[PDB]
Amino acid sequence: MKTSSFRNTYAQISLQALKENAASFKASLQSPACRLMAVVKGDGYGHGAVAAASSALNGGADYLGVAILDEAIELRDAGVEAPILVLGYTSPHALREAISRNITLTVFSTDVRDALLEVASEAESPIKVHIKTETGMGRVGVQTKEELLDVMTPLYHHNNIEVEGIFTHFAEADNLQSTYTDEQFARFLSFIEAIEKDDMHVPIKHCCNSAGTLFHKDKHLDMVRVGISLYGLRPDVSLEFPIELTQAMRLFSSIVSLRKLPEGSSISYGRTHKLSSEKVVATMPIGYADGLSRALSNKGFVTLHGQKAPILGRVCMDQTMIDVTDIPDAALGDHVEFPIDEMAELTGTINYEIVCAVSKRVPRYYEE
Amino acid sequence: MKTSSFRNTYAQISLQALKENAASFKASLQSPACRLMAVVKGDGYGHGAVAAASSALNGGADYLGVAILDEAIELRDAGVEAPILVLGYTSPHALREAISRNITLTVFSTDVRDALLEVASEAESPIKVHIKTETGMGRVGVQTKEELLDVMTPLYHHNNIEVEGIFTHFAEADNLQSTYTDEQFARFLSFIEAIEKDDMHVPIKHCCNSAGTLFHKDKHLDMVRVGISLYGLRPDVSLEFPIELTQAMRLFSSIVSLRKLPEGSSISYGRTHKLSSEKVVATMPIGYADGLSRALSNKGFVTLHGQKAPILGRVCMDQTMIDVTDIPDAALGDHVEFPIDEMAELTGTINYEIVCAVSKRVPRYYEE
Numbered sequence: 001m002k003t004s005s006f007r008n009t010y011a012q013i014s015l016q017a018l019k020e021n022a023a024s025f026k027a028s029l030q031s032p033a034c035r036l037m038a039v040v041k042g043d044g045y046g047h048g049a050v051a052a053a054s055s056a057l058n059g060g061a062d063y064l065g066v067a068i069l070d071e072a073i074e075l076r077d078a079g080v081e082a083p084i085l086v087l088g089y090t091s092p093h094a095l096r097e098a099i100s101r102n103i104t105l106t107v108f109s110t111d112v113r114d115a116l117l118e119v120a121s122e123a124e125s126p127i128k129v130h131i132k133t134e135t136g137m138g139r140v141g142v143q144t145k146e147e148l149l150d151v152m153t154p155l156y157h158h159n160n161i162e163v164e165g166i167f168t169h170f171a172e173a174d175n176l177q178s179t180y181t182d183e184q185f186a187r188f189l190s191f192i193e194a195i196e197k198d199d200m201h202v203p204i205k206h207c208c209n210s211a212g213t214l215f216h217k218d219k220h221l222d223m224v225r226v227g228i229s230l231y232g233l234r235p236d237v238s239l240e241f242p243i244e245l246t247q248a249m250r251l252f253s254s255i256v257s258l259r260k261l262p263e264g265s266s267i268s269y270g271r272t273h274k275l276s277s278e279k280v281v282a283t284m285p286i287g288y289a290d291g292l293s294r295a296l297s298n299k300g301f302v303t304l305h306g307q308k309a310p311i312l313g314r315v316c317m318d319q320t321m322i323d324v325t326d327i328p329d330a331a332l333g334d335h336v337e338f339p340i341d342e343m344a345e346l347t348g349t350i351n352y353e354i355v356c357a358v359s360k361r362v363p364r365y366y367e368e
Numbered sequence: 369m370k371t372s373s374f375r376n377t378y379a380q381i382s383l384q385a386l387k388e389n390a391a392s393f394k395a396s397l398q399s400p401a402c403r404l405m406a407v408v409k410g411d412g413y414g415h416g417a418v419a420a421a422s423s424a425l426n427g428g429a430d431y432l433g434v435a436i437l438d439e440a441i442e443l444r445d446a447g448v449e450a451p452i453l454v455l456g457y458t459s460p461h462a463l464r465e466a467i468s469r470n471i472t473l474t475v476f477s478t479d480v481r482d483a484l485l486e487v488a489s490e491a492e493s494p495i496k497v498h499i500k501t502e503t504g505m506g507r508v509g510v511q512t513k514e515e516l517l518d519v520m521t522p523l524y525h526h527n528n529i530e531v532e533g534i535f536t537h538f539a540e541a542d543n544l545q546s547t548y549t550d551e552q553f554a555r556f557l558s559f560i561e562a563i564e565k566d567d568m569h570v571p572i573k574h575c576c577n578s579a580g581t582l583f584h585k586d587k588h589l590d591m592v593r594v595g596i597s598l599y600g601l602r603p604d605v606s607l608e609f610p611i612e613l614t615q616a617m618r619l620f621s622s623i624v625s626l627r628k629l630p631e632g633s634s635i636s637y638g639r640t641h642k643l644s645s646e647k648v649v650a651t652m653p654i655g656y657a658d659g660l661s662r663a664l665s666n667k668g669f670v671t672l673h674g675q676k677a678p679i680l681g682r683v684c685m686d687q688t689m690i691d692v693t694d695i696p697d698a699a700l701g702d703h704v705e706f707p708i709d710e711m712a713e714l715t716g717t718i719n720y721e722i723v724c725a726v727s728k729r730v731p732r733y734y735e736e
């Protein structure tokens with residue numbers, strides 16, 4: 001993780017916010033036996049995987065979730081010893097590496113099942129797996145009771161494999177007017193009924209993401225998987241948080257040039273903006289190679305001195321211009337802030353993408 | 369740079385293409401005295417700064433360009449010894465570090481001018497600077513003859529500073545129906561006339577980017593600054609290359625799940641796509657945390673087996689679904705390719721952003 005720079009363009013990350021958000025979530029769970037999994041995929045949703053994991057554990061998280069084995073190995077190499085579940089696919093050729101670093105694996109297909117049966121016969125402590133079930137996200141997971149039984153049963157009865165978990169994922173738990181989450185939950189319980197009729201007991205049943213955790217407490221089961229709201233960001237901006245949470249990331253740049261340009265002057269590539277009068281134009285050392293979306297061209301804004309300054313013309317790779325004509329105290333060197341949810345709204349996306357897109361060129365400053 | 373992974377999602381980078389592209393550009397220049405600057409900002413436009421710089425030098429580049437001092441320091445730390453120009457702003461507090469690593473600096477403001485005058489008062493050998501002039505990009509640079517003279521003259525006459533260069537940048541050199549590039553060029557020459565009337569001779573006058581280099585050979589002057597087309601990508605997809613170039617980056621993922629889903633099934637978050645009939649849906653281990661634009665949701669495609677497979681529903685952080693129903697030989701494990709220019713077109717952006725957005729989670733495989 002880049003954590004220093006000679007350029008005043010940076011993401012400030014509050015570790016205390018992350019810790020307190022984990023504690024707030026832990027306190028909110030249906031039962032004290034329910035585990036809090038902190039989901040730190042995508043390099044901690046752009047905040048930094050190791051920083052987010054460490055903070056979340058300090059706040060009471062019980063498990064970590066990542067998307068791919070690479071991310072789990074990164075955590076282990078940084079000295080994180082907490083349980084880690086790879087939520088997505090892990091291929092047969094990667095299984096020995098995963099088991100050697102004590103990484104819990106998601107399984108939903110026979111190629112991985114069969115490789116695991118051969119590999120498990122050659123390992124020290126039991127291998128831990130969670131089985132993924134399909135209930136309506138239309139993404140990954142076994143699809144029928146028959147397939148679940150076919151995939152899980154040989155793993156369950158292998159003397160060196162523990163089927164620790166079984167889970168599903170919700171497509172719209174943030175839509176509080178929809179029956180779909182209850183329908184998915186019913187299908188999930190239907191899968192579970194099938195394995196329990198075959199006397200297979202799985203100790204961690206789980207289905208909730210941030211939205212499920214916040215708004216579907218009846219579905220907390222044995223573990224919840226909190227991602228976006230661990231970072232104090234809403235699953236959907238139409239929602240209001242029912243627990244106390246703080247946004248952990250704030251994105252800043254600064255003014256490195258401040259100039260008056262005459263009426264008729266065009267700004268940036270393609271001359272897509274022409275000044276309607278004399279304007280004071282500030283240039284910032286940030287652009288789309290820092291992850292500032294080019295779709296904010298001629299439509300986004302930054303804040304400074306309690307006012308909004310609109311972006312003029314096209315966002316460049318490394319530089320972006322703003323109009324500070326109505327902000328008389330704007331000066332060379334001023335730091336400015338980028339609103340994360342508003343950038344998502346203006347470009348037709350979600351805060352998840354905005355924070356992940358902050359590129360490796362932008363240092364993260366952990367201010368605690 | 370990440371260069372290995374347990375997941376089959378990757379950017380293949382042809383070093384031979386980069387080297388040959390640099391050679392092709394070098395051969396095309398107006399005169400053999402004209403220098404080729406390889407622009408490798410944004411981590412070599414997402415290809416890898418060190419790899420791109422090394423390849424370009426091997427192909428005949430004379431100078432390297434980066435956006436910010438961080439990038440120049442990275443190249444020096446990797447053992448690159450070629451001249452490097454920081455094209456954007458460098459702040460007063462960073463000047464000593466830059467000069468100690470023999471980095472050429474762009475200057476266009478008095479804060480940096482005055483700090484330089486005090487610092488140069490130090491240093492082993494002369495400090496090299498280029499002066500940025502504003503001619504119509506509306507971004508950075510001195511704006512008037514008076515300002516140019518005020519900024520440059522004390523630097524020119526300091527016994528330990530060399531004003532090696534003076535430059536400008538074009539807003540629409542890729543627009544071959546516009547007079548603006550010729551107008552900018554005339555303003556640039558007007559700046560140059562002003563300093564030469566004051567008997568200040570600058571050895572490297574430069575103004576061309578990729579588009580200027582390709583289509584405005586009369587403006588090559590002492591050096592051209594080739595970025596996007598060094599990577600074999602067009603400045604604008606409406607253009608055809610007038611010289612021989614090869615696209616250096618190719619982006620791939622793979623099928624990690626292949627399932628038949630019934631009519632009426634919804635795919636991914638928000639149920640934004642529902643199957644109009646029974647479909648074979650493949651899931652790929654790639655999503656917007658890898659830099660795959662979420663704006664490709666329900667509209668982008670990948671290629672496999674000589675056909676296009678459309679993206680179904682929303683791109684997730686780490687996974688994306690495609691329809692392979694009309695591709696009978698699609699199988700678990702198939703690798704698929706993402707078309708870079710078409711992804712830009714479909715999401716209303718440019719190839720520059722697409723290749724820079726490929727995130728640090730995606731390994732670069734250097735093919736040669």
Ligand SMILES: *Cc1c(COP(=O)(O)O)cnc(C)c1O
Nearest residue numbers: 039087169209210225226227228
């Ligand atoms: C991303 C993800 C989560 C976390 O979702 P949020 O909305 O970020 O809370 C949980 N589980 C799985 C399987 C995921 O992919």
Ligand SMILES: *Cc1c(COP(=O)(O)O)cnc(C)c1O
Nearest residue numbers: 407455537577578593594595596
């Ligand atoms: C980005 C940039 C270049 C290269 O532009 P391309 O279109 O990528 O060729 C050249 N000069 C300056 C100052 C730049 O910012």
